[PDB]
Amino acid sequence: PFAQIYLIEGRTEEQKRAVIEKVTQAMMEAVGAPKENVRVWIHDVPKENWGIGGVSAKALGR
Amino acid sequence: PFAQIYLIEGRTEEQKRAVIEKVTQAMMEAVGAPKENVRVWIHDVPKENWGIGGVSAKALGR
Amino acid sequence: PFAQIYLIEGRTEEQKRAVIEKVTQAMMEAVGAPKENVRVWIHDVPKENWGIGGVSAKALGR
Amino acid sequence: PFAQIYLIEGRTEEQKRAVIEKVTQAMMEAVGAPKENVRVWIHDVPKENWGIGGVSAKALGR
Amino acid sequence: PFAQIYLIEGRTEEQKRAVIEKVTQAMMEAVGAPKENVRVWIHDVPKENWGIGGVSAKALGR
Amino acid sequence: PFAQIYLIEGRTEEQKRAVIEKVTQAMMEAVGAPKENVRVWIHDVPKENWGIGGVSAKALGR
Protein backbone atom coordinates (compact mmCIF):
# COMPACT_ATOMS: atom_id res chain seq x y z
CA PRO A 1 0.00 0.00 0.00
CA PHE A 2 0.81 3.64 -0.53
CA ALA A 3 0.14 6.71 1.63
CA GLN A 4 0.31 10.27 0.30
CA ILE A 5 0.45 12.87 3.08
CA TYR A 6 -0.27 16.53 2.71
CA LEU A 7 1.26 18.92 5.25
CA ILE A 8 1.39 22.74 5.40
CA GLU A 9 5.05 23.72 4.67
CA GLY A 10 7.45 24.07 7.62
CA ARG A 11 7.51 20.76 9.46
CA THR A 12 11.02 19.65 10.30
CA GLU A 13 13.01 16.76 8.75
CA GLU A 14 12.49 14.99 12.12
CA GLN A 15 8.70 15.37 12.02
CA LYS A 16 8.76 14.16 8.41
CA ARG A 17 10.87 11.25 9.58
CA ALA A 18 8.20 10.41 12.25
CA VAL A 19 5.39 10.70 9.72
CA ILE A 20 7.08 8.17 7.50
CA GLU A 21 7.90 5.85 10.38
CA LYS A 22 4.52 5.98 12.17
CA VAL A 23 2.35 5.89 9.15
CA THR A 24 4.42 2.91 7.86
CA GLN A 25 3.81 1.06 11.16
CA ALA A 26 0.11 2.03 10.99
CA MET A 27 -0.19 0.54 7.48
CA MET A 28 1.68 -2.61 8.61
CA GLU A 29 -0.67 -3.04 11.57
CA ALA A 30 -3.93 -2.20 9.74
CA VAL A 31 -3.37 -4.26 6.57
CA GLY A 32 -0.39 -6.59 7.34
CA ALA A 33 1.74 -5.21 4.57
CA PRO A 34 5.42 -6.32 4.62
CA LYS A 35 7.22 -3.22 5.96
CA GLU A 36 9.31 -3.05 2.77
CA ASN A 37 6.23 -2.85 0.53
CA VAL A 38 4.96 0.32 2.22
CA ARG A 39 5.63 3.60 0.52
CA VAL A 40 4.76 6.85 2.25
CA TRP A 41 5.40 10.21 0.69
CA ILE A 42 4.82 13.73 1.75
CA HIS A 43 3.78 16.95 -0.10
CA ASP A 44 4.73 20.22 1.63
CA VAL A 45 2.04 22.73 0.62
CA PRO A 46 2.94 26.43 0.83
CA LYS A 47 0.81 28.51 3.17
CA GLU A 48 -0.42 30.66 0.14
CA ASN A 49 -1.57 27.39 -1.45
CA TRP A 50 -3.77 25.74 1.31
CA GLY A 51 -7.28 26.97 2.01
CA ILE A 52 -9.70 26.29 4.86
CA GLY A 53 -13.23 27.77 4.55
CA GLY A 54 -12.18 29.95 1.62
CA VAL A 55 -9.18 31.64 3.43
CA SER A 56 -5.53 30.76 2.92
CA ALA A 57 -3.39 29.27 5.69
CA LYS A 58 -1.19 32.34 5.30
CA ALA A 59 -4.26 34.61 6.05
CA LEU A 60 -5.25 32.38 8.95
CA GLY A 61 -1.78 32.95 10.52
CA ARG A 62 -0.87 29.24 10.41
CA PRO B 1 -15.44 18.09 0.36
CA PHE B 2 -11.83 18.69 -0.75
CA ALA B 3 -10.46 20.15 -3.96
CA GLN B 4 -6.92 19.61 -5.16
CA ILE B 5 -6.00 22.08 -7.88
CA TYR B 6 -3.06 21.75 -10.35
CA LEU B 7 -1.76 25.02 -11.92
CA ILE B 8 1.44 25.68 -13.94
CA GLU B 9 3.89 27.49 -11.53
CA GLY B 10 3.98 31.26 -11.37
CA ARG B 11 0.54 32.39 -10.26
CA THR B 12 0.68 35.09 -7.74
CA GLU B 13 -0.47 34.94 -4.11
CA GLU B 14 -3.61 36.86 -5.03
CA GLN B 15 -4.36 34.59 -8.02
CA LYS B 16 -4.05 31.58 -5.73
CA ARG B 17 -6.18 33.29 -3.08
CA ALA B 18 -8.91 33.77 -5.70
CA VAL B 19 -8.70 30.03 -6.57
CA ILE B 20 -9.23 29.20 -2.86
CA GLU B 21 -12.11 31.65 -2.46
CA LYS B 22 -13.90 30.85 -5.74
CA VAL B 23 -13.53 27.09 -5.70
CA THR B 24 -14.75 27.05 -2.07
CA GLN B 25 -17.86 29.12 -3.18
CA ALA B 26 -18.36 26.73 -6.07
CA MET B 27 -18.38 23.71 -3.73
CA MET B 28 -20.76 25.35 -1.24
CA GLU B 29 -23.12 26.21 -4.19
CA ALA B 30 -22.86 22.79 -5.86
CA VAL B 31 -23.08 20.39 -2.83
CA GLY B 32 -24.28 22.71 -0.03
CA ALA B 33 -21.15 22.10 2.02
CA PRO B 34 -20.72 24.41 4.98
CA LYS B 35 -17.99 26.91 4.02
CA GLU B 36 -15.85 25.91 6.98
CA ASN B 37 -15.72 22.24 5.94
CA VAL B 38 -14.28 23.03 2.51
CA ARG B 39 -10.52 22.48 1.99
CA VAL B 40 -8.79 23.59 -1.25
CA TRP B 41 -5.10 23.16 -1.94
CA ILE B 42 -3.03 24.00 -4.96
CA HIS B 43 -0.01 22.31 -6.54
CA ASP B 44 2.30 24.50 -8.52
CA VAL B 45 3.67 22.44 -11.41
CA PRO B 46 7.04 23.52 -12.91
CA LYS B 47 6.95 24.25 -16.59
CA GLU B 48 9.50 21.46 -17.21
CA ASN B 49 7.09 19.06 -15.38
CA TRP B 50 3.84 19.71 -17.28
CA GLY B 51 3.13 17.91 -20.51
CA ILE B 52 0.53 18.67 -23.12
CA GLY B 53 0.53 16.04 -25.98
CA GLY B 54 4.09 14.90 -25.26
CA VAL B 55 5.75 18.32 -25.01
CA SER B 56 6.46 20.21 -21.75
CA ALA B 57 5.21 23.69 -21.24
CA LYS B 58 8.84 24.79 -20.86
CA ALA B 59 9.60 23.54 -24.44
CA LEU B 60 6.34 25.02 -25.76
CA GLY B 61 7.28 28.28 -23.96
CA ARG B 62 10.31 28.75 -26.19
CA PRO C 1 -5.64 23.97 -14.90
CA PHE C 2 -7.10 20.77 -13.42
CA ALA C 3 -9.24 20.24 -10.33
CA GLN C 4 -9.60 16.91 -8.58
CA ILE C 5 -12.56 16.92 -6.22
CA TYR C 6 -13.17 14.43 -3.34
CA LEU C 7 -16.82 14.01 -2.19
CA ILE C 8 -18.39 11.37 0.12
CA GLU C 9 -20.31 8.91 -2.19
CA GLY C 10 -23.96 9.47 -2.98
CA ARG C 11 -24.21 12.81 -4.72
CA THR C 12 -26.51 12.74 -7.62
CA GLU C 13 -25.62 13.21 -11.30
CA GLU C 14 -26.97 16.75 -11.16
CA GLN C 15 -25.03 17.58 -7.97
CA LYS C 16 -21.86 16.36 -9.65
CA ARG C 17 -22.73 18.28 -12.82
CA ALA C 18 -23.00 21.45 -10.72
CA VAL C 19 -19.54 20.73 -9.21
CA ILE C 20 -18.11 20.47 -12.77
CA GLU C 21 -19.85 23.63 -13.97
CA LYS C 22 -19.16 25.78 -10.89
CA VAL C 23 -15.59 24.74 -10.24
CA THR C 24 -14.80 25.31 -13.94
CA GLN C 25 -16.33 28.87 -13.64
CA ALA C 26 -14.32 29.42 -10.48
CA MET C 27 -11.06 28.51 -12.26
CA MET C 28 -11.83 30.69 -15.30
CA GLU C 29 -12.59 33.64 -12.89
CA ALA C 30 -9.56 33.05 -10.65
CA VAL C 31 -6.77 32.32 -13.23
CA GLY C 32 -8.39 33.43 -16.52
CA ALA C 33 -8.14 29.94 -17.99
CA PRO C 34 -10.06 29.44 -21.20
CA LYS C 35 -13.16 27.40 -20.30
CA GLU C 36 -12.22 24.65 -22.74
CA ASN C 37 -8.83 24.04 -21.08
CA VAL C 38 -10.37 23.36 -17.67
CA ARG C 39 -10.66 19.71 -16.54
CA VAL C 40 -12.54 18.77 -13.33
CA TRP C 41 -12.97 15.24 -12.08
CA ILE C 42 -14.61 13.89 -8.98
CA HIS C 43 -13.81 10.93 -6.73
CA ASP C 44 -16.67 9.42 -4.85
CA VAL C 45 -15.35 8.21 -1.49
CA PRO C 46 -17.29 5.39 0.26
CA LYS C 47 -18.49 6.22 3.71
CA GLU C 48 -16.38 3.35 5.14
CA ASN C 49 -13.31 4.96 3.43
CA TRP C 50 -13.55 8.54 4.72
CA GLY C 51 -12.11 9.46 8.08
CA ILE C 52 -12.69 12.56 10.13
CA GLY C 53 -10.54 12.57 13.36
CA GLY C 54 -10.04 8.79 13.35
CA VAL C 55 -13.67 7.75 12.77
CA SER C 56 -15.19 6.84 9.36
CA ALA C 57 -18.24 8.59 8.10
CA LYS C 58 -19.99 5.21 8.05
CA ALA C 59 -19.42 4.85 11.86
CA LEU C 60 -20.39 8.49 12.44
CA GLY C 61 -23.48 7.86 10.27
CA ARG C 62 -24.86 5.38 12.79
CA PRO D 1 -2.76 17.25 7.78
CA PHE D 2 -4.38 14.95 5.29
CA ALA D 3 -3.49 11.40 4.39
CA GLN D 4 -4.65 9.75 1.17
CA ILE D 5 -4.33 5.93 1.33
CA TYR D 6 -4.18 3.60 -1.64
CA LEU D 7 -5.03 -0.09 -1.14
CA ILE D 8 -5.78 -2.97 -3.55
CA GLU D 9 -9.59 -3.43 -3.44
CA GLY D 10 -10.91 -6.10 -1.07
CA ARG D 11 -9.98 -4.88 2.40
CA THR D 12 -12.93 -5.37 4.71
CA GLU D 13 -14.70 -2.61 6.61
CA GLU D 14 -12.78 -3.47 9.81
CA GLN D 15 -9.43 -3.30 8.05
CA LYS D 16 -10.29 0.18 6.74
CA ARG D 17 -11.47 1.20 10.20
CA ALA D 18 -7.98 0.21 11.47
CA VAL D 19 -6.34 2.18 8.62
CA ILE D 20 -8.34 5.28 9.59
CA GLU D 21 -7.73 5.12 13.33
CA LYS D 22 -4.02 4.06 13.17
CA VAL D 23 -2.99 6.53 10.47
CA THR D 24 -4.79 9.36 12.27
CA GLN D 25 -2.97 8.45 15.55
CA ALA D 26 0.32 8.30 13.62
CA MET D 27 -0.14 11.77 12.31
CA MET D 28 -1.17 13.19 15.73
CA GLU D 29 2.05 11.64 17.17
CA ALA D 30 4.35 12.67 14.37
CA VAL D 31 3.39 16.34 13.85
CA GLY D 32 1.49 17.22 17.01
CA ALA D 33 -1.87 17.74 15.36
CA PRO D 34 -5.20 17.68 17.29
CA LYS D 35 -7.45 14.72 16.42
CA GLU D 36 -10.07 16.86 14.69
CA ASN D 37 -7.48 18.34 12.25
CA VAL D 38 -6.44 14.96 10.75
CA ARG D 39 -8.32 13.74 7.65
CA VAL D 40 -7.72 10.25 6.26
CA TRP D 41 -9.26 8.82 3.14
CA ILE D 42 -8.86 5.53 1.29
CA HIS D 43 -8.95 4.64 -2.42
CA ASP D 44 -9.70 0.94 -3.24
CA VAL D 45 -7.92 0.08 -6.34
CA PRO D 46 -9.21 -2.80 -8.50
CA LYS D 47 -6.83 -5.69 -8.96
CA GLU D 48 -6.79 -5.18 -12.70
CA ASN D 49 -5.90 -1.54 -12.17
CA TRP D 50 -2.83 -1.95 -9.97
CA GLY D 51 0.52 -2.62 -11.60
CA ILE D 52 3.66 -3.92 -10.00
CA GLY D 53 6.68 -4.37 -12.40
CA GLY D 54 4.44 -4.08 -15.50
CA VAL D 55 2.04 -6.82 -14.40
CA SER D 56 -1.36 -6.42 -12.82
CA ALA D 57 -2.13 -7.56 -9.24
CA LYS D 58 -4.76 -9.77 -10.88
CA ALA D 59 -2.06 -11.06 -13.19
CA LEU D 60 0.25 -11.74 -10.26
CA GLY D 61 -2.59 -13.93 -8.93
CA ARG D 62 -4.01 -11.78 -6.10
CA PRO E 1 8.73 5.84 -9.35
CA PHE E 2 4.96 5.79 -9.34
CA ALA E 3 2.42 6.63 -12.05
CA GLN E 4 -1.25 7.32 -11.33
CA ILE E 5 -3.41 7.18 -14.47
CA TYR E 6 -6.86 8.59 -14.82
CA LEU E 7 -9.14 7.11 -17.49
CA ILE E 8 -12.85 7.64 -18.27
CA GLU E 9 -14.64 4.38 -17.21
CA GLY E 10 -15.05 1.63 -19.81
CA ARG E 11 -11.60 0.67 -21.05
CA THR E 12 -11.12 -3.08 -21.19
CA GLU E 13 -8.93 -5.26 -18.91
CA GLU E 14 -6.65 -5.64 -21.98
CA GLN E 15 -6.26 -1.89 -22.47
CA LYS E 16 -5.61 -1.55 -18.74
CA ARG E 17 -3.05 -4.31 -19.09
CA ALA E 18 -1.32 -2.32 -21.93
CA VAL E 19 -1.39 0.89 -19.89
CA ILE E 20 0.42 -0.83 -17.07
CA GLU E 21 2.90 -2.53 -19.38
CA LYS E 22 3.70 0.48 -21.61
CA VAL E 23 3.82 3.08 -18.95
CA THR E 24 6.10 0.75 -16.90
CA GLN E 25 8.48 0.46 -19.89
CA ALA E 26 8.27 4.25 -20.40
CA MET E 27 9.28 4.86 -16.77
CA MET E 28 12.12 2.30 -17.08
CA GLU E 29 13.42 4.00 -20.23
CA ALA E 30 13.01 7.62 -19.03
CA VAL E 31 14.45 7.24 -15.51
CA GLY E 32 16.22 3.81 -15.46
CA ALA E 33 14.06 2.46 -12.70
CA PRO E 34 14.40 -1.32 -12.05
CA LYS E 35 11.22 -2.73 -13.62
CA GLU E 36 10.19 -4.19 -10.25
CA ASN E 37 10.30 -0.79 -8.52
CA VAL E 38 7.72 0.72 -10.88
CA ARG E 39 4.17 0.95 -9.68
CA VAL E 40 1.44 2.07 -12.05
CA TRP E 41 -2.16 2.31 -11.00
CA ILE E 42 -5.32 3.33 -12.70
CA HIS E 43 -8.48 5.22 -11.59
CA ASP E 44 -11.60 4.58 -13.70
CA VAL E 45 -13.64 7.80 -13.51
CA PRO E 46 -17.37 7.56 -14.21
CA LYS E 47 -18.64 9.60 -17.14
CA GLU E 48 -20.89 11.69 -14.72
CA ASN E 49 -17.71 12.49 -12.77
CA TRP E 50 -15.29 13.86 -15.50
CA GLY E 51 -15.67 17.37 -16.88
CA ILE E 52 -14.12 19.11 -19.88
CA GLY E 53 -14.89 22.85 -20.31
CA GLY E 54 -17.62 22.71 -17.67
CA VAL E 55 -19.62 19.80 -19.31
CA SER E 56 -19.57 16.19 -18.16
CA ALA E 57 -18.17 13.38 -20.31
CA LYS E 58 -21.65 11.86 -20.14
CA ALA E 59 -23.12 15.12 -21.69
CA LEU E 60 -20.36 15.19 -24.28
CA GLY E 61 -21.40 11.66 -25.42
CA ARG E 62 -17.99 10.14 -24.56
CA PRO F 1 -6.36 10.28 -20.23
CA PHE F 2 -4.15 11.87 -17.64
CA ALA F 3 -1.01 10.51 -16.05
CA GLN F 4 0.38 11.90 -12.79
CA ILE F 5 4.04 10.87 -12.25
CA TYR F 6 5.86 10.82 -8.94
CA LEU F 7 9.67 10.89 -8.92
CA ILE F 8 12.28 11.51 -6.19
CA GLU F 9 13.51 15.11 -6.75
CA GLY F 10 16.70 15.51 -8.80
CA ARG F 11 15.81 14.24 -12.25
CA THR F 12 17.21 16.63 -14.84
CA GLU F 13 15.15 18.52 -17.40
CA GLU F 14 16.04 15.96 -20.11
CA GLN F 15 14.95 13.04 -17.96
CA LYS F 16 11.56 14.72 -17.38
CA ARG F 17 11.30 15.46 -21.10
CA ALA F 18 11.73 11.68 -21.69
CA VAL F 19 9.09 10.92 -19.01
CA ILE F 20 6.63 13.26 -20.76
CA GLU F 21 7.18 12.00 -24.29
CA LYS F 22 7.43 8.24 -23.45
CA VAL F 23 4.45 8.14 -21.09
CA THR F 24 2.32 10.08 -23.57
CA GLN F 25 3.30 7.61 -26.37
CA ALA F 26 2.51 4.71 -24.00
CA MET F 27 -0.95 6.00 -23.37
CA MET F 28 -1.64 6.67 -27.09
CA GLU F 29 -0.59 3.03 -27.78
CA ALA F 30 -2.44 1.46 -24.91
CA VAL F 31 -5.88 3.13 -25.15
CA GLY F 32 -5.91 4.59 -28.65
CA ALA F 33 -5.96 8.22 -27.59
CA PRO F 34 -4.96 11.12 -29.93
CA LYS F 35 -1.76 12.91 -28.89
CA GLU F 36 -3.54 16.13 -27.93
CA ASN F 37 -5.84 14.30 -25.43
CA VAL F 38 -2.98 12.93 -23.26
CA ARG F 39 -1.84 15.07 -20.29
CA VAL F 40 1.22 14.10 -18.26
CA TRP F 41 2.48 15.86 -15.19
CA ILE F 42 5.34 15.20 -12.78
CA HIS F 43 5.70 15.76 -9.02
CA ASP F 44 9.33 15.96 -7.69
CA VAL F 45 9.37 14.61 -4.28
CA PRO F 46 12.12 15.70 -1.86
CA LYS F 47 14.38 12.96 -0.59
CA GLU F 48 13.37 13.65 2.98
CA ASN F 49 9.72 13.34 1.97
CA TRP F 50 9.81 9.92 0.31
CA GLY F 51 9.56 6.83 2.49
CA ILE F 52 10.40 3.29 1.58
CA GLY F 53 9.90 0.68 4.42
CA GLY F 54 9.64 3.43 7.08
CA VAL F 55 12.93 5.08 6.14
CA SER F 56 13.45 8.18 4.05
CA ALA F 57 15.20 8.12 0.65
CA LYS F 58 17.66 10.55 2.25
CA ALA F 59 18.04 8.09 5.10
CA LEU F 60 18.63 5.24 2.68
CA GLY F 61 21.52 7.38 1.36
CA ARG F 62 20.11 8.66 -1.97
Coordinates of N, CA and C in Angstrom, one line a residue, chain D:
Chain D
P1 N -3.3 18.1 8.8 CA -2.8 17.3 7.8 C -3.8 16.3 7.2
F2 N -3.5 15.9 6.0 CA -4.4 15.0 5.3 C -3.6 13.7 4.9
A3 N -4.2 12.6 4.9 CA -3.5 11.4 4.4 C -4.4 10.7 3.4
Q4 N -3.9 10.4 2.2 CA -4.7 9.8 1.2 C -4.1 8.4 1.0
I5 N -4.8 7.3 1.2 CA -4.3 5.9 1.3 C -4.7 5.1 0.1
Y6 N -3.8 4.4 -0.5 CA -4.2 3.6 -1.6 C -4.0 2.1 -1.3
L7 N -5.0 1.3 -1.5 CA -5.0 -0.1 -1.1 C -5.5 -0.9 -2.3
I8 N -5.0 -2.1 -2.7 CA -5.8 -3.0 -3.5 C -7.2 -3.2 -2.9
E9 N -8.2 -3.3 -3.8 CA -9.6 -3.4 -3.4 C -9.7 -4.7 -2.6
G10 N -10.7 -4.8 -1.7 CA -10.9 -6.1 -1.1 C -10.6 -6.1 0.4
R11 N -10.0 -5.1 0.9 CA -10.0 -4.9 2.4 C -11.4 -4.7 3.0
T12 N -11.6 -5.4 4.1 CA -12.9 -5.4 4.7 C -13.1 -4.1 5.4
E13 N -14.4 -3.8 5.8 CA -14.7 -2.6 6.6 C -13.8 -2.4 7.9
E14 N -13.6 -3.5 8.7 CA -12.8 -3.5 9.8 C -11.3 -3.1 9.5
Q15 N -10.8 -3.7 8.4 CA -9.4 -3.3 8.0 C -9.3 -1.8 7.7
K16 N -10.3 -1.3 7.0 CA -10.3 0.2 6.7 C -10.4 1.0 8.0
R17 N -11.2 0.5 9.0 CA -11.5 1.2 10.2 C -10.1 1.3 10.9
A18 N -9.3 0.2 10.9 CA -8.0 0.2 11.5 C -7.0 1.1 10.7
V19 N -7.1 1.2 9.4 CA -6.3 2.2 8.6 C -6.7 3.6 9.1
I20 N -8.0 3.9 9.1 CA -8.3 5.3 9.6 C -7.9 5.6 11.0
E21 N -8.1 4.7 12.0 CA -7.7 5.1 13.3 C -6.2 5.1 13.5
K22 N -5.5 4.1 13.0 CA -4.0 4.1 13.2 C -3.2 5.1 12.4
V23 N -3.6 5.4 11.2 CA -3.0 6.5 10.5 C -3.2 7.9 11.1
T24 N -4.4 8.1 11.6 CA -4.8 9.4 12.3 C -3.9 9.5 13.5
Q25 N -3.9 8.5 14.4 CA -3.0 8.4 15.6 C -1.5 8.7 15.2
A26 N -1.0 8.1 14.1 CA 0.3 8.3 13.6 C 0.6 9.7 13.3
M27 N -0.4 10.4 12.6 CA -0.1 11.8 12.3 C -0.2 12.7 13.5
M28 N -1.1 12.4 14.5 CA -1.2 13.2 15.7 C 0.2 13.1 16.4
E29 N 0.7 11.9 16.5 CA 2.1 11.6 17.2 C 3.1 12.4 16.4
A30 N 3.2 12.2 15.1 CA 4.4 12.7 14.4 C 4.4 14.2 14.3
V31 N 3.2 14.9 14.0 CA 3.4 16.3 13.8 C 2.7 17.2 14.9
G32 N 2.2 16.5 15.9 CA 1.5 17.2 17.0 C 0.2 17.9 16.6
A33 N -0.5 17.3 15.7 CA -1.9 17.7 15.4 C -3.0 17.2 16.3
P34 N -4.0 18.1 16.6 CA -5.2 17.7 17.3 C -6.0 16.8 16.4
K35 N -6.6 15.8 17.0 CA -7.4 14.7 16.4 C -8.4 15.2 15.3
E36 N -9.0 16.4 15.5 CA -10.1 16.9 14.7 C -9.5 17.5 13.4
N37 N -8.2 17.8 13.4 CA -7.5 18.3 12.2 C -6.9 17.3 11.3
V38 N -7.0 16.0 11.6 CA -6.4 15.0 10.8 C -7.5 14.4 9.9
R39 N -7.3 14.3 8.6 CA -8.3 13.7 7.6 C -7.6 12.6 7.0
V40 N -8.3 11.4 6.9 CA -7.7 10.2 6.3 C -8.7 9.7 5.3
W41 N -8.3 9.5 4.0 CA -9.3 8.8 3.1 C -8.6 7.7 2.3
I42 N -9.4 6.7 1.9 CA -8.9 5.5 1.3 C -9.4 5.4 -0.1
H43 N -8.6 5.1 -1.1 CA -9.0 4.6 -2.4 C -8.7 3.1 -2.6
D44 N -9.8 2.4 -2.9 CA -9.7 0.9 -3.2 C -9.4 0.8 -4.7
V45 N -8.3 0.2 -5.0 CA -7.9 0.1 -6.3 C -8.2 -1.3 -6.8
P46 N -9.0 -1.5 -7.9 CA -9.2 -2.8 -8.5 C -7.9 -3.6 -8.8
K47 N -8.0 -4.9 -8.7 CA -6.8 -5.7 -9.0 C -6.3 -5.6 -10.4
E48 N -7.2 -5.4 -11.3 CA -6.8 -5.2 -12.7 C -6.2 -3.8 -13.0
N49 N -6.3 -2.9 -12.0 CA -5.9 -1.5 -12.2 C -4.6 -1.2 -11.5
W50 N -4.0 -2.2 -10.8 CA -2.8 -2.0 -10.0 C -1.7 -2.7 -10.6
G51 N -0.6 -2.0 -11.0 CA 0.5 -2.6 -11.6 C 1.8 -2.6 -10.8
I52 N 2.4 -3.8 -10.7 CA 3.7 -3.9 -10.0 C 4.7 -4.6 -11.0
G53 N 5.8 -3.9 -11.3 CA 6.7 -4.4 -12.4 C 6.1 -4.7 -13.8
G54 N 5.0 -4.0 -14.2 CA 4.4 -4.1 -15.5 C 3.4 -5.2 -15.6
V55 N 3.0 -5.8 -14.5 CA 2.0 -6.8 -14.4 C 1.0 -6.4 -13.4
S56 N -0.3 -6.7 -13.8 CA -1.4 -6.4 -12.8 C -1.4 -7.3 -11.6
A57 N -1.9 -6.8 -10.5 CA -2.1 -7.6 -9.2 C -3.0 -8.8 -9.6
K58 N -3.9 -8.6 -10.5 CA -4.8 -9.8 -10.9 C -3.8 -10.8 -11.5
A59 N -3.0 -10.3 -12.5 CA -2.1 -11.1 -13.2 C -1.1 -11.8 -12.3
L60 N -0.6 -11.1 -11.2 CA 0.3 -11.7 -10.3 C -0.5 -12.6 -9.3
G61 N -1.8 -13.0 -9.7 CA -2.6 -13.9 -8.9 C -3.0 -13.5 -7.5
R62 N -3.5 -12.3 -7.4 CA -4.0 -11.8 -6.1 C -5.5 -11.5 -6.2

